[PDB]
Homo-oligomer: A and B are copies of this chain.
Amino acid sequence: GIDPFTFENATSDAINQDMMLYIERIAKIIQKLPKRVHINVRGFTDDTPLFKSHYELAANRAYRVMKVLIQYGVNPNQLSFSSYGSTNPIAPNDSLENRMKNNRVEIFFSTDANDLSKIHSILDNEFNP
């Protein structure tokens, strides 16, 4: 299914060419969804020491991804972004591997139950050969 947008280094909001292409793919998918469906782009970090806060770094990540989605044709009306800083990690900040996991941006869908079926179907088909 949809993987989060991972960031290569703990302290950067830079998006490499591979994630740029993956954001483009998701943008195109988003434009197939019902118009009443909105997308919240959520930014997170690990607890790597530092940007004057992890909220700032997360916000930049999320904002940048949102900007890329709009560049590739997602309607701004459907979009928002949010920063979660170093909170709500995918995994404890134990290892290199777990920390790297936590530096990411995730897509949340806002949908009624009818459109939820339609998103589900589109995503199930998009990511299953």
Contact = CB atoms under 8 A, between A and B. Distances in A.
Given A80-B80, A81-B80, A83-B77, A63 B70 contact: yes
A56 B60 CA distance: 23
Contact of A55 (B55, B59, B70, B77): B77
Nearest to A57: B77
Nearest to A64: B76
Interface residues of A, number: 17
A75 interface: yes
Contacts of A83: 76-77
Interface string A49-80: 00001011011101100010010000111011
Nearest to A63: B76
Nearest to A70: B63
A100 to B, nearest CB: 22
A59 B81 contact: no
Given A63-B70, A70-B63, A53 B80 contact: no
Contact of A56 (B55, B58, B75, B80): B75
A67 B77 CA distance: 14
